[PDB]
Amino acid sequence: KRPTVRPRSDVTHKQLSAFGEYVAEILPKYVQQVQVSCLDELEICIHPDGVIPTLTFLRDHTNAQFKSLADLTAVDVPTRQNRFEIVYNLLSLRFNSRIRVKTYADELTPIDSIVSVHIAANWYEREVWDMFGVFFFNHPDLRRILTDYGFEGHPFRKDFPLTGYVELRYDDEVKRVVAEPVELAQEFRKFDLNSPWEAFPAYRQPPE
Amino acid sequence: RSRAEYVVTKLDDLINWARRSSLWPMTFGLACCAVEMMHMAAPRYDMDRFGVVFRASPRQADVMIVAGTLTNKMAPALRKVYDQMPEPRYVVSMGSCANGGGYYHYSYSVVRGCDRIVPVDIYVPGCPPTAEALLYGILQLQRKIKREQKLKIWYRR
Amino acid sequence: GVQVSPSGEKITHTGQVYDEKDYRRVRFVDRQKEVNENFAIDLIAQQPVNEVEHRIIACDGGGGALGHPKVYINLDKETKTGTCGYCGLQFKQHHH
Amino acid sequence: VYDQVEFDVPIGSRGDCYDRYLCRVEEMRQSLRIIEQCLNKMPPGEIKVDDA
Amino acid sequence: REKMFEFYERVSGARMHAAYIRPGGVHQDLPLGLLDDIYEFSKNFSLRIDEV
Amino acid sequence: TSVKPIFSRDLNEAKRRVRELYRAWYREVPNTVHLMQLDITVKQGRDKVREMFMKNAHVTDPRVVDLLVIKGKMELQETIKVWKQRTHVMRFFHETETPRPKDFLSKFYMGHDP
Amino acid sequence: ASATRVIQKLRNWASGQDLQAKLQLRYQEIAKRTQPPPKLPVGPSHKLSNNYYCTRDGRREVVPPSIIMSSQKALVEKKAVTPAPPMKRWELSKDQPYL
Amino acid sequence: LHHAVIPHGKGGRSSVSGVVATVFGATGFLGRYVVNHLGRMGSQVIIPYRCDVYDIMHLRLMGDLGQLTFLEWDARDKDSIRKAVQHSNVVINLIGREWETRNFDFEDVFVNIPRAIAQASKEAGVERFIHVSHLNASMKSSSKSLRSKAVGEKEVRSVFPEAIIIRPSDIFGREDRFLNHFANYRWFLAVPLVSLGFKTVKQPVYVADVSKGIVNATKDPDAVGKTFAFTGPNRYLLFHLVKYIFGMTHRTFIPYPLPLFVYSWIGKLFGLSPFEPWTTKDKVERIHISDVMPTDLPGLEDLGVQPTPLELKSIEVLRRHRTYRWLSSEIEETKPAKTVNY
Amino acid sequence: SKVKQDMPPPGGYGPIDYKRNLPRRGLSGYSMFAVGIGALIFGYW
Amino acid sequence: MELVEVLKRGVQQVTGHGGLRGLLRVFFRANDIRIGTLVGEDKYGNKYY
Amino acid sequence: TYKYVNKKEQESEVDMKSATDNAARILMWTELIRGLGMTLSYLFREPATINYPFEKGPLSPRFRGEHALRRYPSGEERCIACKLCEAICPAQAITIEAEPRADGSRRTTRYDIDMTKCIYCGFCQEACPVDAIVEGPNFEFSTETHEELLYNKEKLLNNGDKWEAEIAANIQADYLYR
Numbered sequence A: 001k002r003p004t005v006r007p008r009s010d011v012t013h014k015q016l017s018a019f020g021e022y023v024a025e026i027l028p029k030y031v032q033q034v035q036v037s038c039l040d041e042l043e044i045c046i047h048p049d050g051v052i053p054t055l056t057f058l059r060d061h062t063n064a065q066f067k068s069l070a071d072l073t074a075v076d077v078p079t080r081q082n083r084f085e086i087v088y089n090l091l092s093l094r095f096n097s098r099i100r101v102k103t104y105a106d107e108l109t110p111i112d113s114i115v116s117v118h119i120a121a122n123w124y125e126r127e128v129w130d131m132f133g134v135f136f137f138n139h140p141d142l143r144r145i146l147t148d149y150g151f152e153g154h155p156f157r158k159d160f161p162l163t164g165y166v167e168l169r170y171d172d173e174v175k176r177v178v179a180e181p182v183e184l185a186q187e188f189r190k191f192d193l194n195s196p197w198e199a200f201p202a203y204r205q206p207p208e
Numbered sequence B: 001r002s003r004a005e006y007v008v009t010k011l012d013d014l015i016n017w018a019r020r021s022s023l024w025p026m027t028f029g030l031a032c033c034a035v036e037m038m039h040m041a042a043p044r045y046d047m048d049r050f051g052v053v054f055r056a057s058p059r060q061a062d063v064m065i066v067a068g069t070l071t072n073k074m075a076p077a078l079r080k081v082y083d084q085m086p087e088p089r090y091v092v093s094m095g096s097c098a099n100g101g102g103y104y105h106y107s108y109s110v111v112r113g114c115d116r117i118v119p120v121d122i123y124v125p126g127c128p129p130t131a132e133a134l135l136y137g138i139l140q141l142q143r144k145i146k147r148e149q150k151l152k153i154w155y156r157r
Numbered sequence C: 001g002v003q004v005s006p007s008g009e010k011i012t013h014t015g016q017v018y019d020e021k022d023y024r025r026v027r028f029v030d031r032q033k034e035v036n037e038n039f040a041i042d043l044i045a046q047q048p049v050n051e052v053e054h055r056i057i058a059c060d061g062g063g064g065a066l067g068h069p070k071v072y073i074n075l076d077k078e079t080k081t082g083t084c085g086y087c088g089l090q091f092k093q094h095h096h
Numbered sequence D: 001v002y003d004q005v006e007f008d009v010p011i012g013s014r015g016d017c018y019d020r021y022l023c024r025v026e027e028m029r030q031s032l033r034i035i036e037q038c039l040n041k042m043p044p045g046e047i048k049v050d051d052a
Numbered sequence E: 001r002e003k004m005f006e007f008y009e010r011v012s013g014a015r016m017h018a019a020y021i022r023p024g025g026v027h028q029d030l031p032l033g034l035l036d037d038i039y040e041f042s043k044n045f046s047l048r049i050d051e052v
Numbered sequence F: 001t002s003v004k005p006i007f008s009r010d011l012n013e014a015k016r017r018v019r020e021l022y023r024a025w026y027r028e029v030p031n032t033v034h035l036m037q038l039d040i041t042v043k044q045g046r047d048k049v050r051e052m053f054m055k056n057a058h059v060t061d062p063r064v065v066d067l068l069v070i071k072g073k074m075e076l077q078e079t080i081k082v083w084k085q086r087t088h089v090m091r092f093f094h095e096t097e098t099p100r101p102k103d104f105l106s107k108f109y110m111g112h113d114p
Numbered sequence G: 001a002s003a004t005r006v007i008q009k010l011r012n013w014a015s016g017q018d019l020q021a022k023l024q025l026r027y028q029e030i031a032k033r034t035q036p037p038p039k040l041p042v043g044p045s046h047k048l049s050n051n052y053y054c055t056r057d058g059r060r061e062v063v064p065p066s067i068i069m070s071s072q073k074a075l076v077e078k079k080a081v082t083p084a085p086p087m088k089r090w091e092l093s094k095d096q097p098y099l
Numbered sequence H: 001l002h003h004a005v006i007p008h009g010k011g012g013r014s015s016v017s018g019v020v021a022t023v024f025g026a027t028g029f030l031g032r033y034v035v036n037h038l039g040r041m042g043s044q045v046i047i048p049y050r051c052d053v054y055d056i057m058h059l060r061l062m063g064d065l066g067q068l069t070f071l072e073w074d075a076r077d078k079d080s081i082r083k084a085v086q087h088s089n090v091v092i093n094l095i096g097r098e099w100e101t102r103n104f105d106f107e108d109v110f111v112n113i114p115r116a117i118a119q120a121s122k123e124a125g126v127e128r129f130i131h132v133s134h135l136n137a138s139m140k141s142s143s144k145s146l147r148s149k150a151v152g153e154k155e156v157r158s159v160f161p162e163a164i165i166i167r168p169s170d171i172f173g174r175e176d177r178f179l180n181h182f183a184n185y186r187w188f189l190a191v192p193l194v195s196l197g198f199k200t201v202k203q204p205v206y207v208a209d210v211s212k213g214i215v216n217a218t219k220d221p222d223a224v225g226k227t228f229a230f231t232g233p234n235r236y237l238l239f240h241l242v243k244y245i246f247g248m249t250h251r252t253f254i255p256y257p258l259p260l261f262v263y264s265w266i267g268k269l270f271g272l273s274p275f276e277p278w279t280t281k282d283k284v285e286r287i288h289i290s291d292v293m294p295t296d297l298p299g300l301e302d303l304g305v306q307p308t309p310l311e312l313k314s315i316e317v318l319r320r321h322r323t324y325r326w327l328s329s330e331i332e333e334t335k336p337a338k339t340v341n342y
Numbered sequence I: 001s002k003v004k005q006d007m008p009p010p011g012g013y014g015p016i017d018y019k020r021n022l023p024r025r026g027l028s029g030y031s032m033f034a035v036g037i038g039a040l041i042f043g044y045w
Numbered sequence J: 001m002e003l004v005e006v007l008k009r010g011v012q013q014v015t016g017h018g019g020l021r022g023l024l025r026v027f028f029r030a031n032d033i034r035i036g037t038l039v040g041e042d043k044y045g046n047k048y049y
Numbered sequence K: 001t002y003k004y005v006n007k008k009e010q011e012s013e014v015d016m017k018s019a020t021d022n023a024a025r026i027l028m029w030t031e032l033i034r035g036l037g038m039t040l041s042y043l044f045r046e047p048a049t050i051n052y053p054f055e056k057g058p059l060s061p062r063f064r065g066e067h068a069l070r071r072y073p074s075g076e077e078r079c080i081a082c083k084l085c086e087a088i089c090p091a092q093a094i095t096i097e098a099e100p101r102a103d104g105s106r107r108t109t110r111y112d113i114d115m116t117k118c119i120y121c122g123f124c125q126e127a128c129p130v131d132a133i134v135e136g137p138n139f140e141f142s143t144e145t146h147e148e149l150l151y152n153k154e155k156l157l158n159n160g161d162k163w164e165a166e167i168a169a170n171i172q173a174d175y176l177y178r
């Protein structure tokens, strides 16, 4: 009816909530949270040691059949104890559905790699280790995939600077491309683009 | 002036005419801008008509069209394939990335302009510069290497 | 209009020029420093004052949507004309 | 409006370069079909969402 | 492909990097005659596919 | 104050892993110097390996030193299989960087940076 | 389009396709480069009444996701259920099922 | 001082080192290294050049944007010399040839051009002038170039009284005319040394060490009016030096004691060439002139540079000249040459 | 005035062909082999 | 025939640039000898066809 | 729906005529000959090459080329130093400083555009409230040094003075869409 508001359907929300209850009661050992968003997307947040049983059940169950891994990524929220929230997006072609599985890690607790479940997880976990520094157990070849050779630090972490620490330039005295500490002719101008008036009252946090 | 200076100048004009009439790019591109350089090789613009033919090996290459983003993982390879070209070698930078970093100027893994690695002869601006603009750059390079006087400076030495 | 410094270097409309002992003029040696010859300050000083009859005038800079956001200028002070904040055109109410 | 446009899906049978090539060519043809239907069914109206 | 690049440059002003599709719709409306030119392109394109 | 180990239960097993990694690096250094046409000698490379290990020598957490062993092993493999180049190897020496002196007079004479 | 008929017959036979019917060089069939000025229409919300923004804002209709089960806030015979009804098999094309 | 000449930054590429240096021999061998160091620390480097823009175009990446100003100059144009040195506070003179052309001879190159540069610099008001002569250029030497450089030192000191005179020894580097020359003797049958290479002592100095010394002379407050001697750490006999060069090249070694007068004859025979000669009579006289001992003169130690040894920096020059058989050979595979205290 | 923008003409756009159209050109193999064998026999004679 | 039509287009393209000097000038600087209606000329001397 | 691109329907059996046709196809290289014929048809077609620089590729009034600063018909510069273009610039290629002018107007004393950092996206020209910054359709401004591609306010105003003849015409032709 409203041409500027995205139409919503409650049937998909109900089916995803029912399947969330189904998965949560099938796997109470690892499932910590089940939520369905307003955008009709299902998220199950699990303990880090249950990633292998959860992914294996979701792939090889008859009622799940999530045989395709859409992606594997990490989100750096450096205000919680386990700062890396690791996200698995999975696709079910049999039932035409999408699911999200979330887990957590910090800088010193690796989680189990799911290469034995999905082969794309090999390169995706290599990307996660290269960008965030999350180690993965039982990976066949865990190494850097996107950064330069010998690059120190994980650049997709929050505390890493945007411009980095070193740059490359060609030196004629040594006839080589060499790395120097960062100096910019024009510094990146940080913009404070945040209005001090609350935009969404539905997400108003209680005071501390 | 004396007779020898005119002879040297006419020989040098012949040398430069050959050099600018036959210039071969190294079959080398990086990104968006490489899609535009093959759009310049496309039949509308005809760099082959202009006399400009790809050779894959740097030994048979004259002009190096650095067309795209230079990353920190790519810069040693860029410098290597620049150095392996023979002595009359010219460099055209293409696009904002190869010019001055472009849209990734403040990146940890992007070289802020390919002139930090290779000596750039001419710069072609745009993101991407159109095949029109790259053809303009190629003709400007032809005029630039028409302008030089190697034999005349050698005679003045 | 453009003016030259005692060093011989011409001065932009912003008013900046390098000093005599400033080392940054070797940047201009064997080349040229270009300055836009048309100055907005005297190019408004040659603009005539728009004589209107209303107490409040509306300016959009001309051209409708090709100009600036239209503003309203209050022409009450008889000792000073009203200037549009965008285009700089002066307006004056009629006291005759 | 992909649920409103009508087209076909090229499906291979041997999983090789030739079948992938044929799939790409036939889905160029199906893209041309979608282009024809979009040309005929372009509606009037605005461009932005009407929300400033 | 160059002909299609003329199409994108007519829609957005850049032959490749349009930045035309935006959250909320697209950037500007279609200039007049572009739709007929797209028809003129698509009417002849399947002959080239048969040639390949 | 109880955590989960990565590979080593205590610091001694991780020290054993460190010793094995140092063995492998010390064995590799002559092969690297021979294969990539390096200006340095065999002594300079082994001194650089020792310098990096002594730079990381202050760590006493088993998880951190296990991850340091993991990073050193990936650097070692990336040196075994020739992926690091002459430039990538010589970035360890900083031979184009003028080092900032550690004394207050020099820090005062250069600039405001402490 | 300026080709002679003899070469036109030769390129038509050697290609096997009518090339003059579909020429890949644009000659005069395209639109004029100068156009009449348009007049774009306005959207549905361009009205002076019954257009309160609190009724047409989907941006503030977004709610936080509904928690189905929680390990902390909740502190915890029906049918087996599937995340969606199973995908119906695609029908074979009636236009051209086979190349 | 001026407000724009105050140093800023941490000494990197985009920093300001507060030096405006006009480098005159910037196209040649030592000039590229001194321009590299100047642009590395971040400086306003003016390169007056004579040759082609293609020939100087390897210098274009030595510094940041706008920190290098290339401009034409002529050695017979006092107006152009003054316009090159007009906005500067350091003027560095590296003009030199190893041979004589029909337009410029040794006297002109080593006297008239440095005197004109120093005169234009003094009348333009620079506060630091650095001039690179050669070691053992005292007077009355057996070669024309050394005498010309000595009287050029006299003229430069007469015109600009506080000019820093730098006397380096035979500079070795990647693009030198010393190590590549001795490795270029491999194309002939034997190595024709005078008196079998003995009674001739040499201490070559690294080009990066010379360039660092020149830069520290630009920023050294107590180096004004001084003469420095830029020498290497070890003195070698010419025979043992050539032996070590050919051992590092791994080619062969057959020495030959050949008399000096007929060696000068074949040197000027090679030098009578329209192009750059392989060797000249002046070149072979400079080769067989022994290096003096710097006793009272300050050097790289007093100017802040540790002299890198030839044994340490020799493989970046001579690995070009070796064959495929000995390409992957390390430093330790060649015995270093025996040094001499005298 | 009147709302004017890029819209299709009221008669609709013409047909756009998209199917694979190979020309199906060529003579039969019997004729090809007959011409080949006849050329061989004439050449041999 | 049509070959004579192509040849007469060729001879008018040859004799449509003034004379031999004009034909050689436009041929050796523009690499194209097609004749068209003169649309305009600049204050700099550029001609547009 | 879906379709098969390589799966043939049933089998075409074995017939003597079909075997002869396949033998002729394999032996006399029939598909190779018809590929030759089609390339011959392209040989006898007309090339699509334009005669650059005497013929230029067609463009549109929306084309994003070299940047320019426009003026009012009175000749006053349109920019009011509002820094909206610098705020919206995704590559951060715009640097602006300003102060009140001698008559009190807010005009830029510094409007620099690093055109080696620019991505030529038109965000500045669609964010400018007074149509000050535009992208004129000049693309033929390739340089020989990196420095002279870094544009300041004087270069941008001078370019806007140079290209005002077609910039105003293009804005007149296209402004009713935007």
Ligand SMILES: CCCCCCCCCCCCCCCCCC(=O)OC[C@H](COP(=O)([O-])OCC[N+](C)(C)C)OC(=O)CCCCCCCCCCCCCCCCC
Residues within 6 Å of the ligand: I036, K026, K027, K028, K029, K032, K033
């Ligand atoms: C010099 C004069 C002109 C020569 C021709 C020049 C113009 C034509 C050029 C065509 C383009 C060629 C480009 C390169 C192509 C390379 C591919 C290629 O050709 O592959 C060969 C193809 C290959 O076929 P294929 O590879 O598809 O076959 C499958 C084979 N396996 C499974 C092993 C891969 O054909 C041949 O090999 C056939 C060779 C010629 C045979 C000719 C036989 C003539 C008839 C003999 C007598 C018959 C009757 C006997 C008596 C009966 C009595 C009852």
Ligand SMILES: NC(=O)C1=CN([C@@H]2O[C@H](COP(=O)(O)OP(=O)(O)OC[C@H]3O[C@@H](n4cnc5c(N)ncnc54)[C@H](OP(=O)(O)O)[C@@H]3O)[C@@H](O)[C@H]2O)C=CC1
Residues within 6 Å of the ligand: H024, H025, H026, H027, H028, H029, H030, H031, H049, H050, H051, H075, H093, H094, H095, H096, H097, H098, H104, H109, H132, H133, H134, H135, H168, H169, H170, H171, H177, H178
């Ligand atoms: N090389 C050595 O072994 C030693 C050299 N020196 C001295 O150090 C200085 C620099 O050395 P180096 O780089 O090896 O010398 P080079 O042979 O490389 O030449 C130095 C520079 O002098 C310029 N030059 C020479 N003659 C003229 C002239 N007539 N007019 C204009 N410019 C001219 C050249 O410019 P262009 O390229 O345009 O011709 C070149 O850039 C010289 O004075 C040399 O005598 C001191 C000790 C050892």
Ligand code: SF4
Residues within 6 Å of the ligand: B031, B032, B033, B067, B068, B069, B094, B095, B096, B097, B098, B102, B103, B126, B127, B128, B129, E017, K119
């Ligand atoms: S300059 Fe622009 S078009 Fe070219 S590679 Fe960079 S992002 Fe792509």
Ligand code: SF4
Residues within 6 Å of the ligand: K078, K079, K080, K081, K082, K083, K084, K085, K086, K096, K127, K128, K129, K130, K131, K132, K133
């Ligand atoms: S150019 Fe336009 S958007 Fe930018 S500061 Fe000036 S008025 Fe504002």
Ligand code: SF4
Residues within 6 Å of the ligand: K085, K088, K089, K090, K091, K092, K093, K094, K113, K117, K118, K119, K120, K121, K122, K123, K124, K125
């Ligand atoms: S076109 Fe885009 S990238 Fe360029 S100056 Fe404007 S806003 Fe910045």
Ligand SMILES: [Zn+2]
Residues within 6 Å of the ligand: C059, C060, C061, C068, C084, C085, C086, C087, C088, C089
């Ligand atoms: Zn106004």
